[PDB]
């Protein structure tokens, strides 16, 4: 959460979802599009077979 | 607060300086506004209008555009040589000796090559040069 609030770019680089709670209706002043290649190219995600072949 | 004392110029337009604190002038005629202070920035407008239109793209330097003689020479040579290349390499490869000339120049250290002659003058001159090192 601190990483996302203070260094959002780096947070995006880590594939971290925007952690700010916006249930009050006002969107956060600095959000970003998800970059999930690290968490998708995994042995535990959709890139399971590709990462198994590479392993 | 030190006010501009007086302007001794006969030009009555310059009398505006006497109405402001010197520091004020220092803020808006020097420091940040040094490249603008007490100057009519007509050249800024002229250059902006020069750079926002659709003008001759051929620019030599900041001040001038590329010379029209050079531009037209370049364009005519480019188009004609491109046409020559296309036509010769798509149509005139049947008899190379008819459509191509064999030419070559080499280092002056080596003896003059057999093909080191001025083309279009093979019937008048045979060219050779003394070797050098």
């Amino acid at each position: 959460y601190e990483l996302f609030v203070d260094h959002p770019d780096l947070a995006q680089w880590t594939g971290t979802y925007p952690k700010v709670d916006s249930s009050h209706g006002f969107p956060f002043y600095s959000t970003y599009e998800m970059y999930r290649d690290f968490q998708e190219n995994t042995l535990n995600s959709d890139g399971s077979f590709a990462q198994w072949i590479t392993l | 607060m030190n006010r501009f004392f007086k302007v001794s110029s006969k030009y009555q337009y310059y009398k505006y300086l006497e109405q402001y604190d010197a520091a004020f002038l220092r803020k808006y005629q020097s420091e940040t506004h040094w490249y603008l202070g007490r100057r009519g920035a007509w050249k800024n407008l002229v250059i902006k209008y020069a750079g926002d239109h659709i003008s001759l793209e051929e620019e030599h330097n900041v001040k001038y555009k590329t010379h029209l003689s050079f531009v037209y020479l370049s364009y005519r040579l480019a188009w004609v040589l491109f046409a020559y290349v296309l036509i010769y390499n798509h149509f005139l490869l049947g008899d190379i000796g008819k459509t191509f000339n064999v030419g070559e120049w080499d280092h002056r250290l080596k003896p003059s090559a057999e093909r080191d002659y001025p083309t279009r003058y093979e019937s008048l001159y045979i060219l050779d040069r003394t070797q050098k090192w």
Partner: protein, 89 residues
């Protein structure tokens, strides 16, 4: 200067229309600097009447080495004891 977006957007009298009537846009009032959260976890639950903003903060960020040293002494002595017990046995 606001911490909570809703507060920031509840009664905003600095909106451009107002500033349009004076035509004086201070650089110190850039919205990029107007609001910034507290970098601590803040999430909404459903209270008895409306949303309640609960705060999750697990650990402090002002720890100093002395504290780190005081809690590390048992671990270092445990390492010493285990290594010496291995040597003896």
């Amino acid at each position: 200067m606001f911490r909570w977006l809703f507060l920031y957007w509840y009664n905003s009298t600095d909106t451009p229309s107002a500033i349009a009537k004076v035509n004086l846009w201070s650089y110190i009032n850039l919205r990029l600097f107007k609001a910034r959260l507290s970098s601590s976890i803040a999430y909404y639950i459903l209270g008895l009447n409306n949303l309640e903003l609960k705060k999750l903060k697990i650990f402090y960020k002002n720890t100093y080495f002395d504290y780190i040293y005081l809690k590390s002494i048992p671990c270092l002595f445990l390492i010493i004891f285990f290594t010496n017990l291995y040597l003896f046995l």
